[PDB]
RNA sequence: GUGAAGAGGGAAACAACCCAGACCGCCAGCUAAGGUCCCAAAGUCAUGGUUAAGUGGGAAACGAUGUGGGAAGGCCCAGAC
RNA sequence: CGAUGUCGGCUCAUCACAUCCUGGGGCUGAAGUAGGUCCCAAGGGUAUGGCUGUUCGCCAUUUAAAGUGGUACGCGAGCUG
RNA sequence: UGCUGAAAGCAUCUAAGCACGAAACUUGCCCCGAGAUGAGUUCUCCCUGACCCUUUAAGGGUCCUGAAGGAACGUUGAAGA
């Protein structure tokens, strides 16, 4: 018989890892293998087993080439004319929460399971959160 | 290549501060400052500044004697001073000044108010020529340009801001 | 800038000396209560609540009069908010009057329209009507057409066509203003309002001018 | 300003140049000899 | 040769393209095509160079001091450029 | 083909740029107004009448301009015949 | 369109750096709008009583209590199928 996991028995851990100075394909990738669960052995398909992490400093990830001015953000609203773009460093001046948001949630599964892998990042601006008392542990990429 | 190889002489009266890559001068005419870019080093041998190429950039020797450009250029106009003169040609052309600011009649309906930098020091010792002053080069060829940009020398009578020094390929209007 | 809330009265006219006769929408501005002040370490912005003429003892709501004991003002008929710039400031206990408008020129005036009802495509779109003659039938006010056959094979998002005409929220802008009294609490706006009398309308100053 | 796909030297006073990728041909005595790809 | 009359894996989907011919069952293992950052299972494998165009991830005649090289040649410390 | 209804016209639009105007610029054999050619730019606008069933087209008079094409040569379970 | 400026002792708007630049883009003008499930923020109001039962728990049942507020009916509206 193969051992299966339990969301009840599950147990989820907190960490909290600096998006300063690295790579937005090189953390993304982290982020959802230890979102889903894919660095521990109970890892199973249908449970999210993942751990809750927590990024700081989004504004300052790092990013190689000439992409802060050629990483075009296309995105439709849904009325006919309803097509919009952007790119790296207007996402950043505005809305700099949702340039990891979109690669993690791409490279995590598609469905309400990867919606609840989703719903785990907390995502920040800056260099302090207000979850220390959940008692994280600091992580490195 | 070779402008990096030519070393740059620092004269007495110039103080000179190194932090890192940045680079700090200070003397008679006033302080200037500039940073680096990181493909270079630079090296004080107690009497003349020298640059060499760092290991793992490709575009080394460029980049150094482009610093030392900007030294020798940084050196000089802090020493003695870099100048420049406007000679504007036209009918109805006349230019003044009140203190720190350039007001030009550029055959415009609404006067011409130009502002200046903290660092450039402008006469108009005639209407229909001025000059202008500074420590830096690039801030005085950047307000020429401003000013030559106002009012265009035509190839046809020359009517317009234009250099004291430079020329203008006029043309004769067919028949 | 600090707006107020008036309740509309009618339209008239205004005579003036050189022989012109400039309509005006009479606007009755009773003194505005202030009941709250909103700032930016609490709420995160700065601004201030707006309490404008009375309502029943036995009708305001047991959550209305303790908001309203708070500040010591007397029940009114609503509550609006209007956002602050630097350098106003203002207390709970204040009840502004019209003459703040002494020294305005052009104004902006916010309100609901009239609701129309139901309407239909040529009322509320401006449509036109096919020929009511020469063989038509059934098709005298019908909008016609409404996409292209299977490209994309739908309808867009935004489409017009018959709906709700009225019962919404419009603002006017740059509205010359005629005459303040203070007295009797009136404001004197050239031109049209939206809304039907005796409804309640924001004046503000002209935010573009 | 012409701009076609095939730039060369027309005068001995025609420099080319590359700016942000884009080649293009400038001459210093001939206004119409300035081409751009 | 395949489909027709052929299931399965791969080329994102795909009757004919590649690997490969389903008697049935097994929560055993080994491979081919094709792949080993995530979706999605496997090297963020080691040494060696190229690319700075997202080339890779659609195309020509033609044009260019784009660079990474190979073999020669002219002129040149009586001084070249 | 055990039916996908067809030209033109009316209403209704939408997308594209190899742009008619507005916007910015280069060259001019561009003295100025007025022009010719080319690059970028689709945000907005882009005519009324006589003839013909006609799109197209001819003419009258305006307009800053009276665009090019796709949408089953758009749109008949919207109309017209 | 430029400023400074080397690779290329010069030159050069560019490779390092800086500045100007269109009705194109984001704001700025108006409206909708936290089911924005990531379901948000703020000022207020409301009931502060006891009992037993197995399945010992986000448990089941009884008496008393029925608040803030809402709903329903009626008069109705320049609101509305
Ligand atoms: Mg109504
Ligand atoms: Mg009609
Ligand atoms: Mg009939
Ligand atoms: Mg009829
Ligand atoms: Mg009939
Ligand atoms: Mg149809
Ligand atoms: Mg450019
Ligand atoms: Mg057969
Ligand atoms: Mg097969
Ligand atoms: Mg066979
Ligand atoms: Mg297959
Ligand atoms: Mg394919
Ligand atoms: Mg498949
Ligand atoms: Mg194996
Ligand atoms: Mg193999
Ligand atoms: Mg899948
Ligand atoms: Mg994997
Ligand atoms: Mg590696
Ligand atoms: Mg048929
Ligand atoms: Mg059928
Ligand atoms: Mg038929
Ligand atoms: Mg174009
Ligand atoms: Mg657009
Ligand atoms: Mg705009
Ligand atoms: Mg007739
Ligand atoms: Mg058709
Ligand atoms: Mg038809
Ligand atoms: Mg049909
Ligand atoms: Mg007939
Ligand atoms: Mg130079
Ligand atoms: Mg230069
Ligand atoms: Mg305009
Ligand atoms: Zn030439």
């Given at each position: 018989?193969?051992?299966?996991?339990?969301?009840?028995?599950?147990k989820?851990?907190?960490?909290?890892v600096?998006?300063?100075?690295?790579?937005?394909?090189?953390?993304a990738?982290?982020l959802?293998?230890?979102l889903?669960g894919?660095?521990?052995?109970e890892?199973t398909?249908?449970?999210?087993?993942?751990?809750?992490?927590?990024?700081?400093?989004?504004?300052?990830?790092?990013v190689?080439?000439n992409?802060r001015?050629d990483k075009?953000?296309?995105?439709?609203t849904?009325?006919?004319?309803?097509?919009?773009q952007?790119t790296f460093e207007?996402?950043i001046?505005?809305?700099?929460?949702?340039?990891?948001?979109?690669?993690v949630?791409?490279?995590?599964?598609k469905?309400?399971?990867?919606?609840?892998?989703?719903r785990?990042?907390?995502?920040?601006?800056?260099?302090?959160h207000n979850?220390?008392?959940?008692?994280?542990?600091?992580?490195?990429? | 290549?070779?402008?990096?190889?030519?070393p740059?002489?620092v004269?007495?009266?110039?103080?000179?501060?190194?932090?890192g890559?940045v680079?700090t001068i200070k003397?008679?005419?006033?302080?200037?400052?500039?940073?680096?870019?990181d493909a270079?080093?630079?090296?004080?041998?107690?009497?003349?500044?020298?640059?060499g190429?760092?290991?793992?950039?490709?575009?080394?020797?460029?980049?150094?004697?482009?610093?030392?450009?900007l030294?020798?250029?940084?050196?000089?106009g802090?020493?003695?001073?870099?100048t420049?003169?406007?000679?504007?040609?036209?009918?109805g052309?006349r230019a003044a000044?009140?203190?720190?600011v350039?007001?030009?009649?550029?055959?415009?309906?609404?006067?011409?108010d130009?502002?200046?930098?903290?660092?450039?020091?402008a006469e108009?010792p005639?209407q229909?020529?001025?000059?202008?002053k500074?420590?830096?080069?690039?801030?005085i060829?950047?307000?020429?340009?401003?000013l030559?940009?106002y009012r265009?020398?035509?190839?046809?009578?020359g009517?317009?801001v234009?250099?004291?020094?430079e020329?203008?390929?006029?043309?004769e209007?067919?028949? | 800038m600090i707006?107020?809330?008036?309740?509309k009265?009618?339209?008239?006219?205004?005579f003036?000396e050189?022989?012109?006769?400039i309509?005006?929408?009479?606007?009755e501005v009773?003194?505005?209560?202030?009941?709250?002040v909103?700032?930016?370490?609490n709420?995160?912005?700065?601004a201030?609540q707006?309490?404008?003429?009375?309502?029943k003892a036995?009708?305001?709501?047991?959550?209305?009069?303790?908001?309203?004991?708070?500040?010591?003002?007397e029940?009114?008929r609503?509550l609006?908010?209007?956002?602050?710039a630097?350098?106003?400031?203002?207390?709970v206990?204040?009840?502004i009057?019209?003459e703040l408008?002494?020294?305005?020129?052009?104004?902006?005036?916010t309100?609901?329209s009239?609701?129309?009802?139901?309407?239909?495509?040529?009322k509320?779109?401006?449509?036109?009507?096919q020929?009511?003659?020469?063989?038509?039938?059934?098709?005298?006010?019908?909008?016609?057409?409404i996409?292209?056959?299977?490209?994309?094979?739908?309808?867009?998002?935004?489409?017009?066509?018959?709906?709700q005409?009225?019962?919404?929220?419009?603002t006017?802008q740059?509205?010359?203003?005629?005459?303040?009294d203070?007295?009797?609490?009136?404001?004197?706006?050239?031109?049209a309002?939206?809304?039907?009398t005796?409804?309640?309308?924001?004046?503000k100053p002209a935010?573009k001018? | 300003?012409?701009?076609?796909?095939?730039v060369?030297?027309?005068?001995?006073?025609?420099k080319?140049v590359?700016?942000?990728?884009?080649?293009?041909?400038?001459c210093s005595?001939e206004?119409?000899?300035?081409?751009?790809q």
């Amino acid at each position: 018989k193969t051992f299966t996991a339990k969301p009840e028995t599950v147990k989820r851990d907190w960490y909290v890892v600096d998006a300063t100075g690295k790579t937005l394909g090189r953390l993304a990738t982290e982020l959802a293998r230890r979102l889903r669960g894919k660095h521990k052995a109970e890892y199973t398909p249908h449970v999210d087993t993942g751990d809750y992490i927590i990024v700081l400093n989004a504004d300052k990830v790092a990013v190689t080439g000439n992409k802060r001015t050629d990483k075009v953000y296309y995105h439709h609203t849904g009325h006919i004319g309803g097509i919009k773009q952007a790119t790296f460093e207007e996402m950043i001046a505005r809305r700099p929460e949702r340039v990891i948001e979109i690669a993690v949630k791409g490279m995590l599964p598609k469905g309400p399971l990867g919606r609840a892998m989703f719903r785990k990042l907390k995502v920040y601006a800056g260099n302090e959160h207000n979850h220390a008392a959940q008692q994280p542990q600091v992580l490195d990429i | 290549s070779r402008v990096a190889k030519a070393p740059v002489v620092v004269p007495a009266g110039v103080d000179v501060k190194i932090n890192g890559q940045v680079i700090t001068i200070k003397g008679k005419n006033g302080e200037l400052t500039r940073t680096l870019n990181d493909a270079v080093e630079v090296k004080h041998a107690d009497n003349t500044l020298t640059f060499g190429p760092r290991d793992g950039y490709a575009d080394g020797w460029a980049q150094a004697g482009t610093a030392r450009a900007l030294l020798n250029s940084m050196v000089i106009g802090v020493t003695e001073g870099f100048t420049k003169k406007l000679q504007l040609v036209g009918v109805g052309y006349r230019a003044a000044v009140k203190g720190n600011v350039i007001n030009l009649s550029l055959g415009f309906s609404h006067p011409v108010d130009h502002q200046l930098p903290a660092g450039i020091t402008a006469e108009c010792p005639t209407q229909t020529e001025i000059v202008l002053k500074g420590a830096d080069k690039q801030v005085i060829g950047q307000v020429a340009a401003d000013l030559r940009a106002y009012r265009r020398p035509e190839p046809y009578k020359g009517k317009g801001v234009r250099y004291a020094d430079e020329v203008v390929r006029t043309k004769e209007a067919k028949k | 800038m600090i707006g107020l809330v008036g309740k509309k009265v009618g339209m008239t006219r205004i005579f003036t000396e050189d022989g012109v006769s400039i309509p005006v929408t009479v606007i009755e501005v009773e003194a505005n209560r202030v009941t709250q002040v909103k700032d930016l370490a609490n709420d995160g912005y700065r601004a201030i609540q707006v309490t404008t003429g009375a309502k029943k003892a036995n009708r305001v709501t047991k959550p209305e009069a303790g908001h309203f004991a708070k500040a010591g003002v007397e029940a009114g008929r609503g509550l609006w908010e209007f956002r602050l710039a630097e350098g106003e400031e203002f207390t709970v206990g204040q009840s502004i009057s019209v003459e703040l408008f002494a020294d305005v020129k052009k104004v902006d005036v916010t309100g609901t329209s009239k609701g129309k009802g139901f309407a239909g495509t040529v009322k509320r779109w401006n449509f036109r009507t096919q020929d009511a003659t020469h063989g038509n039938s059934l098709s005298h006010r019908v909008p016609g057409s409404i996409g292209q056959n299977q490209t994309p094979g739908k309808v867009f998002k935004g489409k017009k066509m018959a709906g709700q005409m009225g019962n919404e929220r419009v603002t006017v802008q740059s509205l010359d203003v005629v005459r303040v009294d203070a007295e009797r609490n009136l404001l004197l706006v050239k031109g049209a309002v939206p809304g039907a009398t005796g409804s309640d309308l924001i004046v503000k100053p002209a935010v573009k001018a | 300003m012409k701009v076609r796909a095939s730039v060369k030297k027309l005068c001995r006073n025609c420099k080319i140049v590359k700016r942000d990728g884009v080649i293009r041909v400038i001459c210093s005595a001939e206004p119409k000899h300035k081409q751009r790809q």
